Design a protein around this motif. Structure first.
Motif, PDB file in Angstrom:
ATOM      1  N   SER A 274      50.943  25.982 -48.097  1.00 19.18           N
ATOM      2  CA  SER A 274      50.356  26.899 -49.072  1.00 19.18           C
ATOM      3  C   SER A 274      51.236  26.916 -50.311  1.00 19.18           C
ATOM      4  CB  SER A 274      50.220  28.304 -48.488  1.00 19.18           C
ATOM      5  OG  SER A 274      49.641  29.192 -49.428  1.00 19.18           O
ATOM      6  N   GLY A 275      50.646  26.638 -51.472  1.00 20.92           N
ATOM      7  CA  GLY A 275      51.385  26.689 -52.719  1.00 20.92           C
ATOM      8  C   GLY A 275      52.352  25.529 -52.880  1.00 20.92           C
ATOM      9  N   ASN A 276      53.350  25.747 -53.736  1.00 22.46           N
ATOM     10  CA  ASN A 276      54.380  24.750 -54.002  1.00 22.46           C
ATOM     11  C   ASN A 276      55.741  25.441 -53.959  1.00 22.46           C
ATOM     12  OD1 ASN A 276      54.836  25.729 -56.877  1.00 22.46           O
ATOM     13  ND2 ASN A 276      52.716  25.014 -57.046  1.00 22.46           N
ATOM     14  N   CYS A 277      56.783  24.703 -54.343  1.00 25.93           N
ATOM     15  CA  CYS A 277      58.154  25.183 -54.223  1.00 25.93           C
ATOM     16  C   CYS A 277      58.609  26.035 -55.400  1.00 25.93           C
ATOM     17  CB  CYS A 277      59.110  23.997 -54.066  1.00 25.93           C
ATOM     18  SG  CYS A 277      58.914  23.053 -52.538  1.00 25.93           S
ATOM     19  N   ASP A 278      57.785  26.201 -56.430  1.00 29.33           N
ATOM     20  CA  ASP A 278      58.213  26.869 -57.652  1.00 29.33           C
ATOM     21  C   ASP A 278      57.839  28.345 -57.706  1.00 29.33           C
ATOM     22  OD1 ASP A 278      59.371  24.544 -58.678  1.00 29.33           O
ATOM     23  OD2 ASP A 278      57.484  23.885 -59.584  1.00 29.33           O
ATOM     24  N   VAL A 279      57.244  28.895 -56.653  1.00 29.36           N
ATOM     25  CA  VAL A 279      56.800  30.281 -56.642  1.00 29.36           C
ATOM     26  C   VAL A 279      57.583  31.121 -55.640  1.00 29.36           C
ATOM     27  CG1 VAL A 279      54.507  29.970 -57.615  1.00 29.36           C
ATOM     28  CG2 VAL A 279      54.886  29.480 -55.203  1.00 29.36           C
ATOM     29  N   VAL A 280      57.947  30.543 -54.500  1.00 29.19           N
ATOM     30  CA  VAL A 280      58.629  31.284 -53.447  1.00 29.19           C
ATOM     31  C   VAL A 280      60.102  31.436 -53.802  1.00 29.19           C
ATOM     32  CG1 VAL A 280      57.031  30.746 -51.606  1.00 29.19           C
ATOM     33  CG2 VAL A 280      58.749  29.107 -52.254  1.00 29.19           C
ATOM     34  N   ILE A 281      60.710  32.517 -53.329  1.00 27.08           N
ATOM     35  CA  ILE A 281      62.120  32.792 -53.584  1.00 27.08           C
ATOM     36  C   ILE A 281      62.900  32.556 -52.298  1.00 27.08           C
ATOM     37  CG2 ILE A 281      63.795  34.497 -54.340  1.00 27.08           C
ATOM     38  CD1 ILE A 281      61.375  35.910 -55.751  1.00 27.08           C
ATOM     39  N   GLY A 282      63.888  31.670 -52.358  1.00 24.59           N
ATOM     40  CA  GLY A 282      64.716  31.370 -51.211  1.00 24.59           C
ATOM     41  C   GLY A 282      64.322  30.151 -50.411  1.00 24.59           C
ATOM     42  N   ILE A 283      63.441  29.300 -50.939  1.00 22.61           N
ATOM     43  CA  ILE A 283      63.033  28.104 -50.212  1.00 22.61           C
ATOM     44  C   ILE A 283      64.187  27.103 -50.174  1.00 22.61           C
ATOM     45  CG2 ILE A 283      62.030  26.957 -52.243  1.00 22.61           C
ATOM     46  CD1 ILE A 283      59.654  26.248 -50.145  1.00 22.61           C
TER      47      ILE A 283
END
Ligand SMILES: *[C@@H]1O[C@H](CO)[C@@H](O[C@@H]2O[C@H](CO)[C@@H](O)[C@H](O)[C@H]2NC(C)=O)[C@H](O)[C@H]1NC(C)=O
Ligand SMILES: *[C@@H]1O[C@H](CO)[C@@H](O[C@@H]2O[C@H](CO)[C@@H](O)[C@H](O)[C@H]2NC(C)=O)[C@H](O)[C@H]1NC(C)=O
Ligand SMILES: *[C@@H]1O[C@H](CO)[C@@H](O)[C@H](O)[C@H]1NC(C)=O
Ligand SMILES: *[C@@H]1O[C@H](CO)[C@@H](O)[C@H](O)[C@H]1NC(C)=O
Lengths: 30, 30
Positions: A1-10
């Motif tokens: 779901s989504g990409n790596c530029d939205v989540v915090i702490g990936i």
């Protein structure tokens, strides 16, 4: 779901896919 | 589960297979 530029702490890793290894096992072994 | 002749209100569409294109990927790999 989504990409790596939205989540915090990936973090960075690799996700193992069972299909590809299984595939090689069938044709070469014959 | 079942077929199209028992449910009420079923509609027509296509269900995408993640394996159907990937079997063609196997063909390519060969
Ligand atoms: C996780 O890995 C990606 C690469 O797959 C990293 O993205 C890089 O980020 C730096 C800094 O902005 C860029 O200079 C690189 O060009 C990027 N790589 C690519 C291939 O574009 C990302 O920073 C990594 N994240 C962590 C937390 O290590
Ligand atoms: C959904 O599609 C199927 C075909 O896949 C439709 O079945 C047809 O129904 C008519 C009416 O009874 C028949 O004359 C055809 O022969 C059927 N098609 C086949 C291939 O046998 C079905 O009616 C469609 N349903 C809706 C709601 O559109
Ligand atoms: C977690 O906390 C550390 C400080 O201890 C900070 O350097 C880091 O950026 C934080 N990470 C996130 C995802 O908030
Ligand atoms: C839904 O209601 C409409 C009438 O507005 C009717 O024509 C249709 O057959 C109904 N469908 C189902 C699945 O009950």
């Amino acid at each position: 779901s989504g990409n790596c530029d939205v989540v915090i702490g990936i973090v960075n890793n690799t996700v193992y896919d069972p299909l590809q290894p299984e595939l090689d096992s069938f044709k070469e072994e014959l």
